[PDB]
Amino acid sequence: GAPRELTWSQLIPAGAPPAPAPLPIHDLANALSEAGPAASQQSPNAPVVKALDGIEAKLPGYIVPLEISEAGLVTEFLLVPYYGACIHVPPPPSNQIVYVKTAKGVQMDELYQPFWVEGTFKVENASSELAAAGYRMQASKVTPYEYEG
Template sequence: MRRLACLLLLFCCTLARAELPETDWLDLMPPEDRKALEDMPEISHDSPEGDGTFGQQGGLKQQKDLPAVMYSAKTVAGLDGKRIHIGGYPVPLESDAKGRSTLFFLVPYPGACIHVPPPPPNQIVLVRYPKGIALDDIYAPIWVDGTLKVEKVSNDLADAAYALDAGNVRLVEEGDL
């Protein structure tokens, strides 16, 4: 009986550690938003940030004259409460006493904190990671595992349509590619 209990425990631990399938960023958008994004005209990147001059505030906040899909906070209800594995780029917001990021936005492409326009809110995920991770380079991709929530978050930097309570965050390694 003891041997059976040990085998069952080992099996459960193996399942818990098994990597979740990767969630694609487009999976966070409802089908109508994906279609609108595909049909969207070219966007100009002419801005103070694009010129390398950062005299005005902006962060990830949207301009006011973009196609509607670029402001979309429409979510996919079936993802609420689902455990996911998603790759992206961090935009640090808060850190602990050791300088590890404990709260950050995850975005689908590098440099979203300085490029205009930023992703739509349904392509920005607020990540809560109390353990913290050292983020020396915001252009280095990371993997995040955790439970996704449909949760609108707004601060001075950005608007997000999702939040994720992370159980694991790690840098993407060469073997992942």
């Protein structure tokens, strides 16, 4: 049925540390840069909200592509709360990342904007060399986040 809209803060359980500054201080960005690609994500096994497992959810975010289809579309990606996550700044904690799989791919070109990702939501570990995630989603719909200034 209709997806339950989520916020990124609903993916952090009660008592767990909040999401850090999306733009780390200079000394920290340099320390994580000097450290290996392993050390990039400082909370790769962050606590997860187990009551979210199996629901139909809807979450906004930016797309970090992981796989391209035969058709030239992104079919596997990380959903993150901010643009540049894993690329321009360190990865977010693993409870601020969703590993998404979609049959209806997204155009590689239009990934500068945020999107709404709707689908079956799972509390299952997912790893990539780029980042670890505590959540997974089999998307039904990937639609641009609409906002007019």
